[PDB]
């Protein structure tokens, strides 16, 4: 793994950009190339170094125009650092909440969805489960470029795998029914999450199931409740949204089908 195993001193750390459940993110500079990169400093963890690297090797092969590339990892000193390509406009959630809606119009929202579906079709092809698909994990570049990031990150940390609490911790409103029930994930659970992401995009970054307590979500879903069509959301996009939320994962469309659907919508809408 010499092509991507780095040393902390290989990168100049700058300001903190933010952080999440896995660690903090900083803007950094890969000295060798005077290249600005994103540096995620993972929390202290117990995961086997061998298991970590094998997982990271898989991620290193994820190469697509709409997936944030893994550039390297610093593993000589635990906790490990994850170096990825720097996205100039931050996460998609904040982007949508602060954007100029006349600029980021219906065609742009469609473009963003198209890009994300392309990236996911690729992950599906690689049988790579993202497990954290959501607007917070979509990053923005120049000219409305959108890239899916932090795919499979959960498999690089043991973290709170085990707790004495009853039940488990989840980003509940993005979690497919079967995942909540069994704490197991698949490409299909990523499809369900993609549906919630579409809703996030359609609403310019609103929090899903507004007014519904997290603890009430599963029951509602079991009884067929689903978020209603967002204001201004095209009927066909909502249709896809609803297909993503089929109770049986088997009944949900594949990302290849979703991407094809969006490419068509994007084409027609281009005119």
């Amino acid at each position: 793994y010499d092509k991507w195993e780095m040393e902390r001193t290989d990168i100049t750390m700058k300001h903190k950009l933010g952080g999440g459940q896995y660690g903090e993110v900083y803007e950094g500079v890969w000295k060798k190339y005077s290249l600005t990169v994103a540096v995620k400093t993972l929390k202290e963890d117990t995961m086997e170094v061998e298991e970590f690297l094998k997982e990271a090797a898989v991620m290193k092969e994820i190469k697509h125009p709409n997936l944030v590339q893994l550039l390297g990892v610093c593993t000589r000193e635990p906790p490990f650092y994850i170096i990825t390509e720097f996205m100039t406009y931050g996460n998609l959630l904040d982007y949508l909440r602060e954007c100029n809606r006349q600029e980021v119009n219906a065609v742009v929202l469609l473009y963003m969805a198209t890009q994300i579906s392309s990236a996911m079709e690729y992950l599906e092809k690689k049988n790579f489960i993202h497990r954290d698909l959501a607007a917070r994990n979509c990053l923005v570049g120049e000219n409305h470029l959108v890239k899916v990031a932090d795919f499979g990150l959960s498999r690089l940390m043991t973290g709170d795998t085990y707790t004495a609490h009853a039940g488990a911790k989840f980003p509940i409103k993005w979690t497919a029914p079967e995942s909540l029930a069994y704490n197991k994930f698949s490409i299909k659970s990523d499809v369900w999450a993609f549906g919630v992401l579409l809703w996030e995009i359609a609403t310019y970054g609103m929090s899903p199931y507004p007014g519904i307590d997290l603890s009430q979500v599963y029951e509602l879903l079991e009884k067929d409740y689903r978020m209603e069509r967002p204001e201004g959301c095209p009927e066909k996009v909502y249709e896809l949204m609803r297909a993503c939320w089929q109770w049986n994962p088997s009944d949900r469309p594949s990302f290849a089908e979703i991407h094809q659907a969006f490419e068509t919508m994007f084409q027609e809408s281009s005119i």
Partner: peptide, 8 residues
């Protein structure tokens, strides 16, 4: 709040 605990 994004995270919450869920007991099946």
């Amino acid at each position: 709040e994004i995270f919450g605990e869920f007991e099946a």
